[PDB]
């Protein structure tokens, strides 16, 4: 089980999307194109709605099939966007998590993507998550997206 | 050890 933390070098907002949210679109698209079914775990319902819109536009000139959890075809869309209240569809290969605290369901996945936001006020939360992935037996690494 |  591997957990990768992407280091953000900015907190530049575009079209109502946080720098992390923008990165999520790029990573979800890349992972789906590699042949994976993807779960995006949002912190809240409103963030799920933002990403459901954004993934039709980002990356540009791309068709990335996706839906909110509970919507789309049977078994869910190739990329599914869930939030704490919402049961996600199963048989997914990679979790991209926006949850501010470690989510117990993360242990269901062999590949997890998490983030270290640029804002100092968000660093403590990120450190806490990193610790919790370690306790749950994940092999940890940090990376910069290209 | 946390690298950030």
């Amino acid at each position: 089980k591997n957990a990768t933390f992407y280091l953000l070098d900015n907190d530049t907002t575009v079209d109502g999307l946080s720098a992390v949210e923008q990165l999520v679109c790029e990573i979800a698209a890349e992972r789906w194109r590699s042949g994976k079914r993807v779960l995006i775990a949002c912190e809240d319902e409103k963030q799920a709605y933002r990403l459901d819109e954004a993934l039709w536009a980002r990356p540009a000139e791309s068709f990335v099939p996706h839906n909110l959890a509970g919507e789309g075809p049977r078994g869910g869309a190739p990329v599914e966007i869930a939030w704490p209240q919402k049961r996600s569809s199963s048989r997914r290969d990679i979790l991209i998590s926006l949850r501010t605290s470690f989510a117990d369901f993360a242990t269901a996945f062999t590949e997890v993507v998490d983030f270290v936001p640029y804002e100092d006020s968000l660093k403590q939360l990120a450190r806490e998550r990193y610790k919790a992935y370690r306790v749950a037996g994940f092999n940890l690494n940090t990376a910069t997206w290209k | 050890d946390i690298p950030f």
Partner: protein, 102 residues
């Protein structure tokens, strides 16, 4: 239509199967490009009667005389530029999930 074919793609100007957007749609349909038959409206007319295959028409308003789920999108240049056209195309595919994802 050969037995191996799983999708008929129709356009007046047929795109390269390696067009990245075409690739994305094929990936979403779970269709390999070697299972795609690309036909102009002219060639579609020459098919045997009662031909059956799922199809994707691009910028072609007239429904095909082909049995199977037919999804229709605007021309590729519209689909490449417009998030809402992409969302509508995915909605079409979802409505016909029984045909595309059996």
């Amino acid at each position: 239509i050969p037995a191996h074919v799983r999708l008929v793609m129709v356009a007046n100007d047929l795109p390269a199967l390696t067009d990245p957007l075409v690739s994305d749609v094929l990936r979403a349909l779970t269709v390999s490009p070697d299972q795609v038959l690309q036909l102009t409206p002219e060639k579609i007319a020459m098919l045997p009667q009662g031909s059956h295959c799922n199809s994707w028409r691009l910028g072609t308003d007239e429904p095909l005389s082909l049995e199977g789920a037919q999804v229709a999108s605007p021309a590729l240049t519209d689909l490449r530029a417009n998030p809402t056209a992409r969302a509508a195309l995915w909605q079409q595919i979802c409505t016909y999930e029984h045909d595309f994802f059996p």
